Amino acid sequence: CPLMVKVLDAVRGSPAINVAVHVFRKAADDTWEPFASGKTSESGELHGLTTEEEFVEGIYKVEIDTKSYWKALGISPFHEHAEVVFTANDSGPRRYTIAALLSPYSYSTTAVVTNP
Amino acid sequence: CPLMVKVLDAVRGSPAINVAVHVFRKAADDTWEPFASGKTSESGELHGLTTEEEFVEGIYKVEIDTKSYWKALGISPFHEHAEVVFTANDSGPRRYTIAALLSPYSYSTTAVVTNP
Amino acid sequence: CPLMVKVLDAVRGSPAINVAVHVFRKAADDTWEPFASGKTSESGELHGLTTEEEFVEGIYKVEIDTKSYWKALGISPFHEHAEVVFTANDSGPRRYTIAALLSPYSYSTTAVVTNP
Amino acid sequence: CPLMVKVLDAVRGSPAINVAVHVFRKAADDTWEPFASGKTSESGELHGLTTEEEFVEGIYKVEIDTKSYWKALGISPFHEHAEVVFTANDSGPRRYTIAALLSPYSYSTTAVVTNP
Ligand SMILES: OB(O)c1ccc(/C=C/c2cc(O)cc(O)c2)c(Cl)c1
Numbered sequence: 001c002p003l004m005v006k007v008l009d010a011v012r013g014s015p016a017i018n019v020a021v022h023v024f025r026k027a028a029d030d031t032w033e034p035f036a037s038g039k040t041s042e043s044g045e046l047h048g049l050t051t052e053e054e055f056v057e058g059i060y061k062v063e064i065d066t067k068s069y070w071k072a073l074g075i076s077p078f079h080e081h082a083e084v085v086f087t088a089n090d091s092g093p094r095r096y097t098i099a100a101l102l103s104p105y106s107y108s109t110t111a112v113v114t115n116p
Numbered sequence: 117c118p119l120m121v122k123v124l125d126a127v128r129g130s131p132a133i134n135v136a137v138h139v140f141r142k143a144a145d146d147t148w149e150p151f152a153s154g155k156t157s158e159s160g161e162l163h164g165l166t167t168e169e170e171f172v173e174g175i176y177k178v179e180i181d182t183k184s185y186w187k188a189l190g191i192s193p194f195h196e197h198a199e200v201v202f203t204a205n206d207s208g209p210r211r212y213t214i215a216a217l218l219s220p221y222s223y224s225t226t227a228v229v230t231n232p
Numbered sequence: 233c234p235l236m237v238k239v240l241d242a243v244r245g246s247p248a249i250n251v252a253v254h255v256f257r258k259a260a261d262d263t264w265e266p267f268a269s270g271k272t273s274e275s276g277e278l279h280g281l282t283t284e285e286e287f288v289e290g291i292y293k294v295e296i297d298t299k300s301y302w303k304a305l306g307i308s309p310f311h312e313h314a315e316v317v318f319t320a321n322d323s324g325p326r327r328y329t330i331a332a333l334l335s336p337y338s339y340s341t342t343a344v345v346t347n348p
Numbered sequence: 349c350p351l352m353v354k355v356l357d358a359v360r361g362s363p364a365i366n367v368a369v370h371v372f373r374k375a376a377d378d379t380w381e382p383f384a385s386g387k388t389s390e391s392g393e394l395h396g397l398t399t400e401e402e403f404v405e406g407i408y409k410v411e412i413d414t415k416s417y418w419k420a421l422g423i424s425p426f427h428e429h430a431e432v433v434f435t436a437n438d439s440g441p442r443r444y445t446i447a448a449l450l451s452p453y454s455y456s457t458t459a460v461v462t463n464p
């Protein structure tokens with residue numbers, strides 16, 4: 001797929017499983033249109049959010065529901081969620097992996113952008 | 117200073133200087149109302165955004181114009197901006213420092229929540 | 233394999249390719265014995281460092297040559313290398329992924345520990 | 349203060365208090381000679397490690413006893429310690445802050461290098 005999301009847990013040393021993820025795309029009217037959604041697998045990965053034909057040039061926001069994830073482990077986390085906003089495919093079609101590493105009061109995110 | 121924002125540059129190994137920073141607070145209609153903003157100092161810090169009386173419980177968003185920072189340095193930046201969304205809670209006397217460490221394709225953020 | 237190393241580049245938004253990696257194991261005499269070595273592939277991954285029979289209980293140090301990596305891109309980085317030191321398999325045999333995310337003046341590392 | 353060390357807790361969202369910190373300097377025989385050490389304050393900071401005259405160019409190692417920190421909080425910590433290895437260079441008047449952000453299975457570190 002042209003878009004994949006990977007989530008890691010820095011407290012447990014494991015993939016972040018069952019993490020809800022929502023993708024929005026900025027519409028012409030400048031509002032965030034819902035584009036795709038899903039949940040991470042046993043390996044902390046989310047595959048199949050979209051296809052090459054559907055994943056056109058645009059501004060995208062990937063929202064990772066970190067709060068729900070931590071609450072289900074008894075932790076009262078700082079953030080509501082992690083948000084990643086970026087322009088996609090404005091220099092031709094590429095493959096995007098959005099990775100996040102999660103702690104209760106901190107997170108980091110990076111992007112791996114590759115051209116097939 | 118119940119809220120401070122500090123921004124660092126992981127490429128140059130320096131404070132992120134003259135970075136635009138916006139704080140929004142979610143309203144009743146769940147809209148993002150502008151709350152405070154400014155530009156980071158020579159120390160990469162932004163103080164005096166708000167006061168203890170004005171900084172009530174609620175949901176807050178800190179938005180960092182990372183795109184403009186990297187452009188001014190001539191790196192092609194991946195993110196449109198860096199966004200940090202959290203709930204301010206009154207559980208005792210608290211002060212919040214929102215730190216962000218910036219790279220062209222990644223950022224990390226942490227909250228340092230302390231009792232004065 | 234029971235030990236894999238993954239390295240990402242936060243400046244370029246890509247896997248960190250051709251990164252030299254050395255693994256040491258603390259010997260009885262309390263010196264660091266050379267245990268395994270290798271280089272990351274096109275995907276930023278290093279496979280085949282060791283086997284289940286060889287990867288016994290111990291204290292291990294994984295040294296990632298970050299300086300050589302950046303120098304070959306014209307960057308004069310802060311760190312000599314990234315070092316990850318940890319006790320392995322003292323609670324039974326497990327699989328270890330050591331991940332690093334690299335910037336010129338910063339890096340982060342995490343561990344994904346799974347039980348097959 | 350040409351060298352400061354600051355340590356933060358990504359789980360509790362707080363300064364890492366009373367953390368042991370050791371600084372070593374590589375000798376001619378390429379041995380790690382003890383150079384300075386101490387314990388972080390209530391602010392997670394360690395000042396007065398050295399002086400401008402004593403802090404000559406060379407290779408330095410900052411070692412943080414993260415294992416003992418997490419044990420005191422009852423989390424099973426992955427790393428034996430966190431280590432940061434860098435070359436101090438005289439290219440102009442410089443001051444170094446070595447920051448580390450700690451999780452049980454991960455840490456990130458950055459250098460803030462500034463001209464007084
Ligand atoms: O295919 B795999 O086995 C795999 C393993 C680990 C990662 C980790 C990515 C990462 C993101 C951060 O913000 C900080 C950090 O230290 C690591 C990834 Cl993308 C893939």
Ligand SMILES: OB(O)c1ccc(/C=C/c2cc(O)cc(O)c2)c(Cl)c1
Nearest residue numbers: 215217224225226447449456457458
């Ligand atoms: O004195 B202060 O007000 C202060 C507060 C916070 C930091 C450091 C923040 C930091 C954040 C990350 O997401 C990764 C990382 O390695 C470091 C520093 Cl240096 C200083």
